[PDB]
Ligand binder design. Structure first.
Ligand SMILES: Nc1ncnc2c1ncn2[C@@H]1O[C@H](COP(=O)(O)OP(=O)(O)OP(=O)(O)O)[C@@H](O)[C@H]1O
Ligand SMILES: Nc1ncnc2c1ncn2[C@@H]1O[C@H](COP(=O)(O)OP(=O)(O)O)[C@@H](O)[C@H]1O
Ligand SMILES: [Mg+2]
Lengths: 15, 50, 483, 521, 141, 53
C-alpha cells in the first residue's frame, strides 16, 4: 500500500 | 475567457499543491512506518533464534 | 498393542511440550489423558511439541500423553453429505454419528502430472459476471479475493446453490458435490448458511466443515485439509467436487498462531516461512483427473480478504501465484450499485474460454471487449472535457453492459438464460432502453422469450444458425419497459 | 555407521551421526519410510549432528529412524536416456514409463565452469516474436529473463518460445519446472506429445526434450533443488556431448522462495524482505552454471515472477544482473489488450548494440523506444486535456506510437485457444521493414486497429482494406432476414423434438457405490 | 588493459570474496597513489558488496540494522571510500579517484545503502531511466 | 469483559430472557492481553500484538 500513495504523488505533481 | 482560465488554473495549482502537501506528509508517515515495521520483523526473527 | 506414553512437561496457550513419545511420528495424532486430542508437530531431541485440538485448560503438568499410532485423518464418503462437521471430521449438527463413511488422511500428496488431464468442461457459477468474463472449468482453482464485505461469500454460496439446480437436470455422472469449509468464522454466521442450504435444498449435496473462531488454532489450520479430504472422495471415485475455503486468510492466521507458539522464527508479518507451502499443498489437490483415474474433478474456491484493496499482502500474493484465475471484488464498485462488485479489469481466468459454455464463448467475447473500451473512456468523461459521439457510443453501450452483469444475491441464473441475456445486450436489442431499468428490462427478456428456446440452447450448447436468427426474431416480439 | 533422525521440525530434519558425518550437500536416505525420502545435508550443527532439508514430506518421520549416507550428493540420470522423460528432483521417473536408461548418472551439485572457459560470442537468437526481436533481441547462447507479476503472460510467452526456437534447432532441450502449477506442467507434457517433441514408446530415442518437474505441491527442499537437476541434464549435453542445448526454467523465483521457506529453520536470521541472508549467493551459484562454455552452449530462458508487480523486490532484482536479455512483462500492457504484454521500454538486451545487430536494426529499435517514450510523456496531458493543443507535431507522434503499440502485439501459436486467432511467426527482416515504415510515416493512412494482432506490415494492409469492407458491409443486412427465410430456420418445436433427452437418474448412486468400493480392494 | 587491473569477485564466489574485493582492488590501486602516480578505482556494484557483507554478518549472528544490514555498514563503505585521496606534495602528490556504483530500485536515493554512499562521496552522477528512454545517453539527471 | 458476559449469560441461560450487553472499548481486552503476552515469553505477532489475537 506504499506504491498506491506514491503513484498519487505521480499524478498530482504533473497535474 | 483567457483571464478566467488564468484565475481558474491558478486556483488549481494551489489545490494541487495543497493536495500534494498533504500527500507527502502522508507518504513520509508511511515511509517511517514501513521502516519501523520491516525492522521489528527482523528483530523478532532474530530474537526467536537467539 | 503396546502404547508409548509421554509425560507433559509444560502446557500453555494451546501448546503442550511432552517428554518421551520417541516412537511418535511427525504429524501424528496423540491422545491426552484428559480426553483431548493433539498433533505432534515439531519432534525435538528433548521434547515433543504438541498442538492441542481443543481447550488446553484440562491438561496439567505431568499428564499422560498416549500416541494413537495414526497420522491425522477424517471420515470421508457419501455419509458426510448433508452434515455439518467440525475441523477434523466430527459432526456438530446434532444428528448422530457419521454413518456410511471411511477414515482417510488429511495430508495427501497432490496428484502429479501423469494423473491429470486438461480442464475442459465448465463449472457454472450461476453468477453471470463470472460465467461470461472469468469462466471456471472443472478442476480449476479460482481465487475469490476482495475486501472485508465485498460479497465474496455470496459469489461462493451462489456456486453451491446453483449446483443443486444443475444436479436435478444432469445425469448421475456429471453432478457436482459441494464442500464449504468455513475457517475462523462466527458460529451464528455458519448457522445462517446451513439454514440457507436446507431452505434452498443445496444441503443434499453439501458438506459443511466448520472451524469457528472459538475453535483452537490447530482446528482452523487443519480444517481446509480435512474438508479437501472429504471433497477428494468425489474426485477420486469419478464424481465431481467443489471445495470452497472461505477465508484462507483466517487459516494462515491460525497457522501463524501455532508456528509462533511452537517457537518457529517469524517471517514477513510474523508469518511462518512455509506459509506458501501451507496453501500450495492444499490448492494443488484441486485437479481434473485423467480417465485412467476416473475422470473426476475437484474445483477449488479459496477466499482471501484484503485490507484496503491491498492485494500486495503477503498471504494474498501467495494465493494469486497458486490459483489459476482470480475474481477480484472491489469496494467502490460494490457501492456504485454494481453487484457482484467484480473488477473486470483485474479478474482473469487462466483456463480461459477453453472450459466455458460455447453458447457464451461467441457472445461474451464482444462483451469483454466492449467493456474494455468502456473503462478508459469513462476515466476521461469523469472530468467533463468533451465528447466524440463514437466515444459516447461505447460509453453508453458499456453502461448497458455493466448494468446487465448486475445480479440478485441469492438467485443464480442458469447458463442458457445468461447467454440469452448477454445476447440481448451485445446484439443491440437492449438499446432504445434507459440505463436505469435494464435491471428490470431483462425479466421481460427471460420471461417473454419462449421457454422452449432455452431447451435448444441448453441441448446444443451453442446458438446454431437455425437458432441465432430464430431468437433474435423473438427478441423483437418482446415488450420492454419504457421503449 | 548409519545416522539416526534426532529432530524433525517441518521440512528440516536433524540427523545425528556417531562417527564420520557426511559432507555438506550430500544425499541421505531414510529407510523405513513409506516413500523414498531423500535428505540433503545443509550444515553441520556441531555435536555430531547434521541439519538437512528433505526432498519429500517429513510426515511419518520418527526420531531414531535409521538414515543412510550415500557418500555423494543427489545423483540423477543424465544423458540421451532422459530425452522424452519427466524426472523428479532426485531423478525418479514420474511419467509412468519404466525406469530411465541412466547412462552415467551425475551429481546435481558442481561449481561454475571457470573465468577462462567463458565464451564472448554474440549472435542473435531469432524468436519470431516481433516485440522481442526488435527492442530486446535474445542472444544465441545467453540467459533470457521473462519478468512479470502473476497473470501477465510469463508461461504463454515461454510456451511460444518453446515451439518457435526449440521445435526446430540443432541440439536438445530441457524444461525445468520449478515450483509452478502441476496443471500447466501436464499441459506442457501433452502439448509436446502432439507436436512430436516428446515421443513415447519405442520412438523415445528421437525425443528432443527432457522434463524435470518440481511443482508447487512439493516441499521447499524439493523445489530448491529442481533447477539444479534441470541444470545437470543440460550440463551433460553441454560438457559431455558438446552440443547446443536449450534450458527453459519456469519461475526461477520459486528457487529463491523455496530456500527462504527453510532458511529460518536452518538457524539463519531473516533479511530485509524476509528472504534468506544468502539470497544473492544461492541464486548466483545456480546462474553461474548456466553458461556457454568452450565445449557447448546453454541458451537459457527463465521466467521470473515478481511478487506484487514489483521489480523493486529483492528476488527479481537480484536476477536482473544475471541475464543478457530481460523481457519485462507489464500489467498495464496486458490490461490494454496488447499481447505479448512486453514493456517495450523496460525490456533490455545486451544484443542492442549497433556493432552487434547492425545500424538498421539499432536505429529502428532506438526510434521505436523514442516514440513510445514521448507518447508516455504526452499521455500525462492527453488523459487530462484531450489531444487538441499539441500543435500537430506531438499529435503525429501520438498516432505513430499508437500504431507502434498495436504492431508489437502478435497472435501466438500457443494462444489460439485463448486469443482465438492462428499464430504468426514474424521474421527478423519483416519486423525491421515494418517498424521502419510506421516510424518514417510510410503507413499513416491505415487505421491503428489494423496493426492489432497481425503478423507483419503486409498483414496490416491486408487487414485495413478488410476493415473498410467490413463496415461498408454493415448496411446490407438491414433489409431482410427478419421474416420468411427459405426454411433453413425451422420452427421451435421442430428443434425441441430433435433434443435427445438424457437419463436423469435421481438416486445419486452414492451409498451403493461406497459399499461397492468397500467389498472391492 | 595496459593500464587496467580487473578485480573480479563474481556471483558464484563466496560472500567473503565479494566483500573483500573492493578492498583488494583499492589496495592494488593505492600502489599508484602512494608512489606519486594517479589511480582510478571503479566499484562496479558497491550495493552488491554490501549485500555480501550483510550475508556474513547475519550468518555470524551480529545484530541486524534497518534493512538487516550490520551497524558498521556505514563504516564498511566509508573506510573504503576515504582511501581515495589526493596526496600532498611531500607524499609524492599522487591521487586515487573513486567511482562507486550504487544501483537504486525505482530511483529512490532514500535506500539505506544509497543514503550511506551519498554521504561519504563528494558528488553523485544520477542516471535516470526516464531520460534513458527519451534518447538521452548518458541519462544523467 | 468475561465478567460482564457471565452476568449477561446467566440472564440468557438460566433466567431465559433478552439481555442488552453494552461493552465500551472491546479493543482494550485485546490491548490488555497484548501488554501481558510480552511478559509470558511469546514471540510477538504482526504489529507487536500477541500471536493468539
Ligand atoms: N450481488 C449482491 N447483491 C446484493 N447484495 C449482495 C450481493 N452480494 C453480497 N451482498 C450482500 O452484501 C453483504 C456482504 O456480502 P458477503 O457477506 O457475502 O461478503 P463477504 O466478502 O463474505 O464479507 P465478510 O467479510 O463479511 O465475509 C451481505 O449482506 C450480502 O448479502
Ligand atoms: N500471449 C498471450 N496472448 C493471449 N493471452 C495471453 C497471452 N499471455 C497471457 N495471456 C492471458 O493472460 C494469462 C496469463 O498468462 P500466464 O502465462 O498464466 O501468466 P503468468 O505465468 O505470468 O502468471 C493467460 O492465462 C491468458 O489468459
Ligand atoms: Mg506461470
Amino acid at each position: 500500500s506504499n506504491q498506491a500513495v506514491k503513484q498519487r504523488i505521480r499524478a498530482i505533481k504533473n497535474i | 475567457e483567457h483571464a478566467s482560465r488564468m484565475s481558474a488554473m491558478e486556483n488549481s495549482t494551489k489545490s494541487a499543491g495543497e493536495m500534494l502537501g498533504k500527500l507527502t506528509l502522508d507518504y513520509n508517515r508511511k515511509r517511517q512506518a514501513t521502516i519501523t515495521t520491516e525492522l521489528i520483523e527482523i528483530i523478532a526473527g532474530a530474537s526467536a533464534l537467539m | 498393542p503396546v502404547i508409548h506414553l509421554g509425560r507433559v512437561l509444560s502446557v500453555g496457550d494451546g501448546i503442550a511440550r511432552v517428554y518421551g513419545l520417541k516412537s511418535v511420528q511427525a504429524g501424528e495424532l496423540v491422545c491426552f489423558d484428559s480426553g483431548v486430542k493433539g498433533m505432534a508437530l515439531n519432534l525435538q531431541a528433548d521434547h515433543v511439541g504438541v498442538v492441542v485440538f481443543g481447550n488446553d485448560s484440562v491438561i496439567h503438568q505431568g499428564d499422560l500423553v498416549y500416541r494413537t499410532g495414526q497420522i491425522v485423518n477424517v471420515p470421508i464418503g457419501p455419509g458426510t453429505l448433508g452434515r455439518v462437521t467440525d475441523g477434523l471430521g466430527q459432526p456438530i449438527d446434532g444428528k448422530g454419528p457419521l454413518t456410511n463413511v471411511r477414515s482417510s488422511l488429511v495430508e495427501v500428496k497432490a496428484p502429479g502430472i501423469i494423473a491429470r488431464q486438461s480442464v475442459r468442461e465448465p463449472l457454472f457459477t450461476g453468477v453471470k459476471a463470472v460465467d461470461a468474463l472469468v469462466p471456471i472449468g472443472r478442476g480449476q482453482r479460482e481465487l475469490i479475493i476482495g475486501d472485508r464485505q465485498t460479497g465474496k461469500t455470496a459469489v461462493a454460496i451462489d456456486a453451491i446453490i446453483h449446483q443443486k439446480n444443475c444436479n436435478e437436470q444432469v445425469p448421475k455422472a456429471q453432478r457436482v458435490y459441494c464442500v464449504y469449509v468455513a475457517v475462523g468464522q462466527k458460529r451464528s454466521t455458519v448457522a445462517q448458511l446451513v439454514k440457507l442450504f436446507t431452505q434452498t435444498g443445496a444441503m443434499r449435496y453439501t458438506i459443511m466443515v466448520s472451524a469457528t473462531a472459538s475453535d483452537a488454532a490447530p482446528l482452523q489450520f487443519l480444517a481446509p485439509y480435512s474438508g479437501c479430504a472429504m471433497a477428494e472422495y468425489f474426485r477420486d471415485t469419478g464424481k465431481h467436487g467443489l471445495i470452497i475455503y472461505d477465508d484462507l486468510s483466517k487459516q494462515s492466521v491460525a497457522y501463524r498462531q501455532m508456528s509462533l507458539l511452537l517457537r518457529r522464527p517469524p517471517g514477513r508479518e510474523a508469518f511462518p516461512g512455509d506459509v506458501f507451502y501451507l496453501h500450495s499443498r492444499l490448492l494443488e489437490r484441486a485437479a481434473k483427473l485423467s480417465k485412467e483415474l476416473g475422470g473426476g474433478s475437484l474445483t477449488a474456491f479459496p477466499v482471501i480478504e484484503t485490507q484496503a484493496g491491498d492485494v500486495s499482502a503477503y498471504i494474498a500474493t501467495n494465493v494469486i501465484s497458486i490459483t489459476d484465475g482470480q475474481i477480484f471484488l472491489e469496494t467502490e464498485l460494490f457501492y456504485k450499485g454494481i453487484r457482484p462488485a467484480l473488477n473486470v479489469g483485474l479478474s482473469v481466468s487462466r483456463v480461459g474460454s477453453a472450459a466455458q459454455f460455447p453458447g457464451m464463448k461467441q457472445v461474451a467475447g464482444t462483451l469483454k471487449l466492449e467493456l474494455a473500451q468502456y473503462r478508459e473512456v469513462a476515466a476521461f468523461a469523469q472530468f467533463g472535457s468533451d465528447l466524440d459521439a463514437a466515444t459516447q457510443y461505447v460509453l453508453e453501450r458499456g453502461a448497458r453492459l455493466t448494468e446487465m452483469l448486475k445480479q440478485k444475491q441469492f438467485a443464480p441464473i442458469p447458463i442458457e438464460r445468461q447467454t440469452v441475456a448477454v445476447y440481448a445486450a451485445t446484439k443491440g436489442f437492449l438499446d432504445k432502453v434507459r440505463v436505469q431499468d435494464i435491471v428490470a428490462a431483462e425479466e421481460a427478456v427471460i420471461s417473454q422469450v419462449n421457454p422452449a428456446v432455452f431447451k435448444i440452447l441448453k441441448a446444443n450448447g451453442k446458438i446454431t444458425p437455425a437458432l441465432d436468427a430464430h431468437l433474435k426474431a423473438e427478441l423483437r416480439k418482446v415488450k420492454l419497459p419504457g421503449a | 555407521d548409519a545416522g539416526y533422525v534426532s529432530q524433525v521440525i517441518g521440512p528440516v530434519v536433524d540427523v545425528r551421526f556417531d562417527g564420520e558425518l557426511p559432507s555438506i550437500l550430500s544425499s541421505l536416505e531414510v529407510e523405513g519410510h513409506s516413500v523414498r525420502l531423500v535428505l540433503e545435508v545443509a550444515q553441520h550443527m556441531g555435536d555430531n549432528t547434521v541439519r538437512c532439508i528433505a526432498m519429500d514430506s517429513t510426515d511419518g518421520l520418527v526420531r531414531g529412524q535409521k538414515v543412510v549416507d550415500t557418500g555423494s550428493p543427489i545423483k540423477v540420470p543424465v544423458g540421451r536416456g532422459t530425452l522424452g522423460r519427466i524426472m523428479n528432483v532426485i531423478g525418479e521417473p514420474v511419467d509412468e514409463q519404466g525406469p530411465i536408461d541412466a547412462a552415467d548418472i551425475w551429481s546435481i551439485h558442481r561449481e561454475a565452469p571457470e573465468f577462462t572457459e567463458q565464451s564472448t560470442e554474440q549472435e542473435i537468437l531469432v524468436t519470431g516474436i516481433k516485440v522481442v526481436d526488435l527492442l530486446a533481441p535474445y542472444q544465441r547462447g545467453g540467459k533470457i529473463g521473462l519478468f512479470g507479476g502473476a497473470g501477465v503472460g510469463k508461461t504463454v510467452l515461454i510456451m511460444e518460445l518453446i515451439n518457435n526456437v526449440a521445435k526446430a534447432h540443432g541440439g536438445f532441450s530441457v524444461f525445468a519446472g520449478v515450483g509452478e502449477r502441476t496443471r500447466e506442467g501436464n499441459d506442457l507434457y501433452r502439448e509436446m506429445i502432439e507436436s512430436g517433441v516428446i515421443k513415447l514408446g519405442a520412438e523415445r530415442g528421437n525425443s528432443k526434450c527432457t522434463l524435470v518437474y518440481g511443482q508447487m505441491n512439493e516441499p521447499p527442499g524439493a523445489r530448491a533443488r529442481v533447477a539444479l537437476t534441470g541444470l545437470t541434464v543440460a550440463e551433460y549435453f553441454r560438457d559431455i556431448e558438446g552440443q547446443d542445448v536449450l534450458l527453459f526454467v519456469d519461475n526461477i523465483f520459486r528457487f529463491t522462495q523455496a530456500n527462504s521457506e527453510v532458511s529460518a529453520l536452518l538457524g539463519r536470521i531473516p533479511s530485509a524482505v524476509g528472504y534468506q541472508p544468502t539470497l544473492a549467493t544461492d541464486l548466483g551459484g545456480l546462474q553461474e552454471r548456466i553458461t556457454t562454455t568452450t565445449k557447448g552452449s546453454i541458451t537459457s530462458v527463465q521466467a521470473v515472477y515478481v511478487p506484487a508487480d514489483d521489480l523493486t523486490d529483492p528476488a527479481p532484482a537480484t536476477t536482473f544482473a544475471h541475464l543478457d536479455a530481460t523481457t519485462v512483462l507489464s500489467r498495464s500492457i496486458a490490461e490494454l489488450g496488447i499481447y505479448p504484454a512486453v514493456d517495450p521500454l523496460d525490456s533490455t538486451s545486451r544484443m542492442l548494440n549497433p556493432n552487434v545487430i547492425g545500424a538498421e536494426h539499432y536505429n529502428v529499435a532506438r526510434g521505436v523506444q523514442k516514440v513510445l517514450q514521448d507518447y508516455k510523456n504526452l499521455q500525462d496531458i492527453i488523459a487530462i486535456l484531450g489531444m487538441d493543443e499539441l500543435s500537430e507535431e506531438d499529435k503525429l507522434t501520438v498516432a505513430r506510437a499508437r500504431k507502434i503499440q498495436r504492431f508489437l502485439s502478435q497472435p501466438f501459436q500457443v494462444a489460439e485457444v485463448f486469443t482465438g486467432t492462428p499464430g504468426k511467426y514474424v521474421d527478423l527482416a519483416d519486423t525491421i521493414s515494418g517498424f521502419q515504415g510506421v516510424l518514417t510515416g510510410k503507413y499513416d493512412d491505415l487505421p491503428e486497429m489494423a496493426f492489432y494482432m497481425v503478423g507483419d506490415i503486409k498483414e496490416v494492409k491486408e487487414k485495413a482494406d478488410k476493415m473498410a469492407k467490413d463496415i461498408a458491409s454493415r448496411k446490407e443486412a438491414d433489409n431482410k432476414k427478419v421474416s420468411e427465410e427459405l426454411k433453413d430456420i425451422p420452427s421451435l418445436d421442430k428443434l425441441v423434438s430433435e433434443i435427445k433427452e438424457v437419463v436423469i437418474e435421481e438416486d445419486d448412486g452414492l451409498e451403493e457405490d461406497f459399499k461397492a468400493e468397500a467389498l472391492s480392494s
